[PDB]
Amino acid sequence: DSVYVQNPQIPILVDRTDNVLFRIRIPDATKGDVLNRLTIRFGNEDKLSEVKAVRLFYAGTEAATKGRSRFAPVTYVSSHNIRNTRSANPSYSIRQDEVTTVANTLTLKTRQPMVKGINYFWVSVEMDRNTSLLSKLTSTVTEVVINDKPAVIAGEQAAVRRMGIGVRHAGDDGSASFRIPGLVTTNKGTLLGVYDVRYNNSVDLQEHIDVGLSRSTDKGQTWEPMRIAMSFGETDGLPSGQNGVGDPSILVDERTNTVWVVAAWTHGMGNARAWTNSMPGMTPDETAQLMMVKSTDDGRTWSESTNITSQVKDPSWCFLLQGPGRGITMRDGTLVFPIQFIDSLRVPHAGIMYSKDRGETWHIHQPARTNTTEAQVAEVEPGVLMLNMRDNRGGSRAVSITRDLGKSWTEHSSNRSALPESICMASLISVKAKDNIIGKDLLLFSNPNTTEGRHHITIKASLDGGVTWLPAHQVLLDEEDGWGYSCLSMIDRETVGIFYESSVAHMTFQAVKIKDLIR
Amino acid sequence: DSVYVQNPQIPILVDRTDNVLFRIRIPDATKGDVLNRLTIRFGNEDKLSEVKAVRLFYAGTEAATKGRSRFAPVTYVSSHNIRNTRSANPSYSIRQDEVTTVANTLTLKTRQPMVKGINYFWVSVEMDRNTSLLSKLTSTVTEVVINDKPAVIAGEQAAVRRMGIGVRHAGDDGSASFRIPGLVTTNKGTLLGVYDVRYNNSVDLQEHIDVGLSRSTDKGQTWEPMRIAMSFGETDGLPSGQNGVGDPSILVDERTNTVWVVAAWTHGMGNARAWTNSMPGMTPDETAQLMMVKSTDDGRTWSESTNITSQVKDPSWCFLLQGPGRGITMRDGTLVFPIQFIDSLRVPHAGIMYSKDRGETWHIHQPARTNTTEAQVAEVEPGVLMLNMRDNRGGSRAVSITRDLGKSWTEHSSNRSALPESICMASLISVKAKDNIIGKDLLLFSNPNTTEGRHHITIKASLDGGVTWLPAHQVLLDEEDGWGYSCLSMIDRETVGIFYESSVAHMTFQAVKIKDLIR
Numbered sequence A, B: 001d002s003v004y005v006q007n008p009q010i011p012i013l014v015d016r017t018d019n020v021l022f023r024i025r026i027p028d029a030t031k032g033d034v035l036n037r038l039t040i041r042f043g044n045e046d047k048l049s050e051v052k053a054v055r056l057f058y059a060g061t062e063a064a065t066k067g068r069s070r071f072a073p074v075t076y077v078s079s080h081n082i083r084n085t086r087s088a089n090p091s092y093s094i095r096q097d098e099v100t101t102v103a104n105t106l107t108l109k110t111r112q113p114m115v116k117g118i119n120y121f122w123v124s125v126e127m128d129r130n131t132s133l134l135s136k137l138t139s140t141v142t143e144v145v146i147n148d149k150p151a152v153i154a155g156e157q158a159a160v161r162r163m164g165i166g167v168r169h170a171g172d173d174g175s176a177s178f179r180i181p182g183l184v185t186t187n188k189g190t191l192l193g194v195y196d197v198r199y200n201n202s203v204d205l206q207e208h209i210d211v212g213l214s215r216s217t218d219k220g221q222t223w224e225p226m227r228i229a230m231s232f233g234e235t236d237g238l239p240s241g242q243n244g245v246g247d248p249s250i251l252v253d254e255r256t257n258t259v260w261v262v263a264a265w266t267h268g269m270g271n272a273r274a275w276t277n278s279m280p281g282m283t284p285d286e287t288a289q290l291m292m293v294k295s296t297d298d299g300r301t302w303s304e305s306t307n308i309t310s311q312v313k314d315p316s317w318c319f320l321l322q323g324p325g326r327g328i329t330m331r332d333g334t335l336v337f338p339i340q341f342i343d344s345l346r347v348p349h350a351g352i353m354y355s356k357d358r359g360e361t362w363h364i365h366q367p368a369r370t371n372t373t374e375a376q377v378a379e380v381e382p383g384v385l386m387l388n389m390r391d392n393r394g395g396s397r398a399v400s401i402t403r404d405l406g407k408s409w410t411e412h413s414s415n416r417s418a419l420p421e422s423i424c425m426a427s428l429i430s431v432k433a434k435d436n437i438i439g440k441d442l443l444l445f446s447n448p449n450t451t452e453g454r455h456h457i458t459i460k461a462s463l464d465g466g467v468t469w470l471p472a473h474q475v476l477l478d479e480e481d482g483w484g485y486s487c488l489s490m491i492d493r494e495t496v497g498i499f500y501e502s503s504v505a506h507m508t509f510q511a512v513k514i515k516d517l518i519r
Ligand SMILES: CCC(CC)O[C@@H]1C=C(C(=O)O)C[C@H](N)[C@H]1NC(C)=O
Pocket: A180, A204, A205, A247, A264, A274, A275, A321, A373, A374, A424
C-alpha cells in the first residue's frame, strides 16, 4: 500500500563501514508481506567510483507504545559504543542484500516475511577510504515492490548528502570519549584539531582528561595519529583522575606560525565537577589553573606547560578558564583567546585575554556581559573585536563589540536576536576579502541551530559584519542529536573546515565550499 | 589529631587483584603531612597463608562540595568497567607500599605529602586464587603515624570479612553486563547458576539478551566456562536485539535430577521495555513467550526451547513470565515455578505454576495478591506452599500460603510486616531437618535488607516456618550498592550458597555455614 522514506541530513563518514543513506518505515504490513525489490537512483553527476558498497538491512519492528512516525527502533550505527563505532550493530540490523559495484540504478532484494504493522529497513552506503571530502551523493528510492506490486513511496528524501571523516571515535586509543573541539589552519595550510581525551567516561573535569591533537597536511583527507598536546599525569603524587586538563582553545600566531593551546588544569577536587567545586585563591590546590603549551614545528611537537594563572586570574574568582574552540591573531599581530570567569558570587562572565608580545605575557580587563560563559572572538573590522557568547538566559547568542581589547564593551545590533541557541558552545571566525574566493569580508558561524537540545549543526555566513545571517547563506550538516560543540577554520581560499561533536563521531571533520554557503 | 577507618562489609573476591580491606579518611591534614606508617593486625586463627598481597593506596582528596563524612572520592574497584573489574582503577589510586608475605602484624609506609584538609588512603587485600570460600579475616588498623606521631584512630572496623568469587564480571566473554541470578544444587552436589547475558548494555528486555549458565563441581571454588542455556539469535529473520530471552528461573527435579530453566522470550518490540510493551494475545509477534530448556546430564548440555505459553497464559494478560531465581520439587514430586502476570488493566499479580508429570504439562490457577510481581516459593510443611512476594506498595514482602497449589490463598502472619524490602527480587528456600547439620526445619531468605535503595544484602534464617526472623539469625554479606537480586541453594548439609548481584561483581557466589546463621 504505502511506504515512508527518510534521507537523513547527516555526514557520510569515509572511514566508516556503514552509513545511514535511507531509513524506511512500512507502517501497516500484513504478516507475510515481503519487500521483494527496492530500486535506488543516483544523480548523473555523482562519482559512483567512490562508493565501495550499498547494503539493505532489516531492523524488525517498533514497540506498541512508541507510535508510528519514527524511522528506526534504535540507533543503527553507534557513535558511543567503544567496541564498534564503524559498522551497524549486528544485533539491531540483519543484512538482506549487498552490491559492491554501484551504477546510477541499483536494485536491492529481500525474502524476509514482515510482521503485522510497522517494519523497518534502511540502506547503508560505504565509501572508499580515499573518497573526496567535497563529493556529494543525490540518492532517491524510486521503486519499492511488496508482493510483486509497486507500493506508494512518500517522504522528504531529496537531501544532497555530504562526506565527512571521523577523526576521533569513542574507544579510539583506549579513550572512552573525546569532547570540546578546537581547529586552526597553520601558515603551511596544516589543519590542527584539539580536544579532551576523556579516558574513564564522558564527564567534565574533574577526571582523567588530557588535551589531544590531530594533524592533517592534506586538507583533512588523512589525519596523523593522536599526539598529547598537554597532560599532568600523577603530578604532586595525586591520581591522574585528580589531575585532568581540558576545554582546550588553540590559535596560530599568524606572524611566526607559533601555535598556542590554552586549557584548564584541575588539581585534586575528588571526582566532582570543577564548574561547582573550583574555589577562590591562586594555587593549584585552591583553584583551576590556566595552562599553555606551544609548537614551533607546525604542531608536530609541543612545549612543556607554563602556568599563566598569576598573570590574569583575580584571586576572588572561583574559576578562570579559556573559552573552548580557538583564538585569533589580529591585523596588528595581537594574539586573542576568549575567556570566562565565575566571580565570588558564582556569576559567570565572558571576556577576552590578549598578548602583544608573541604570547610572552597575557592580560584580561573587563567582562563583556553577565551570565555568559563560552565565547569565540573575531576581528569583524580593523581594531574591532566581536565577542559571540553562550547566554544562560537561553534562546539566542549574546553579541558585544570592543575596540580596546575589553576595557569597554558595546552591545551589537545582533545581540540576543540574530543567532538562536540552546545554551551551547558556538564557533565564529572572520575571513578577509583577499583570503577567500568570494572576494568579500565574511563572518562564519557554527552551532546547533535550535533553542532546544543539540542537533541541526549548521554553518551560517554574514556579508555585513554579523548584522544579518540570511537563511540562504547556511548549510545544514547534522540534523540528529550530538554533544553540539564545533570549531571553524578556513582550509584554503575556497573551503571552510568544521571540527565538531556530531551524531556520527565524537570528533568529526567536514569541508564545505564557500560557494555552497554563498550564491 | 584524629583519623577515621572503615572496614567495609563487602565480599573479598578470590579472583580479584584488589579488594577494599580498609578505607581511611584523614579529615584535617596540614599541607606536607606524611602518613609515615600504618599497622594492621589479623586475629590468631586467620589463615594468612591464603593472603597473596596487601597494598596501601593514595586516592588524593575530596571535592569542596561533598562534605567530610565520606570514606572515598570515587569507587576504587569498578564492577561495571568492561575493560577492568579485577584491579583498582590506576587513574584513581596510586600504590604507596606492598607486602607479599603477611604476618599477624603488618606495617605499610608512604612518603606522599598530603594536601590541606581531606586525604584518602585505602588498604587492598589480594587472596590466593584457591582461597577457601569459607575462610574469614578479622583485621584492625592498630596504629597510624603522621610526622612520627601516632594519631588517634576512630571508626567501626570490627567487621568479620568473608570471601566470595566473581563468577561473572561486566565485560566477560564480550558481554556488557549480567543480571537476574538463579541457583540450584543438583542431586550430584553440582551448583548451577543462571543469569541474563546482556551483550549491548544493562537495560531490560527488549534487547540482545541470552540466558547463560555457570557450573561448579567443587562447591563454587571453580566455575566451568559459560554455557548458553537459552538463545533465540535471529529467529524469523528478526534482529537478535528484538529476540532477547531473560529473567531466568531454574529448578532441579529432585526425583530425576532433570534440571529445568524457564525464561521470557520477547520477539520484536523495537528497543523498548517489555514490561510496558508486551500486549494481550498468544503469538510471539503479540506477547512475551514462556520458554523452557532442560538438562539430563547435570547441566553440561541443554535441550532446544519448548513453548509453554499455550498451556498456562490467559490471552487477555499483557505479560506472563516466571518469577526470576529458582523453583522447587515438593515432597510429592510436584515441580513448582513462581510466576507473575500483568492483567488487561496493567495490574501485576504473583502466583505459582506447577507440573505433576515431570514437567510435561504446566498449570496456573489463581493469583495470590494484587500489585505483586517477583516471588519465590518454598514448601514450609508437607503439601503447604509459602509464596514470598515483591510488593509495589513498598516497605515489606507480601507472604501468602496455599495448600491447593494456588486455587485458594491465605495471608501468612508475617505478611507485610516481618521482612523489609525496597521493592526488589528476594530468594526464599526451605531446608528439611534430616538434610542439614542443625537437625531442624529451616527457611532461608535473602534480599537487600532496606526500605530504600539496594544494599545490605543479607541472609536471614527462621526456625518457626517464617513466623519469626530473629536479628541474631542473619548474616550481612554486602552493605554497598548493587542491583540487589539474589538466589539461595544449600551446597551440602552444613553450608548455604548465595548467587547474587553485588557491589563487587555482576554475578557473585558466597558460601555461609548454617552455624554462622544459627549460633
Ligand atoms: C565551566 C562551566 C561550563 C559552562 C556552563 O561548562 C561546560 C559545559 C559543557 C556542556 O554544556 O556540555 C561541557 C564543557 N566541558 C563544560 N566545561 C567545564 C570546564 O566543565
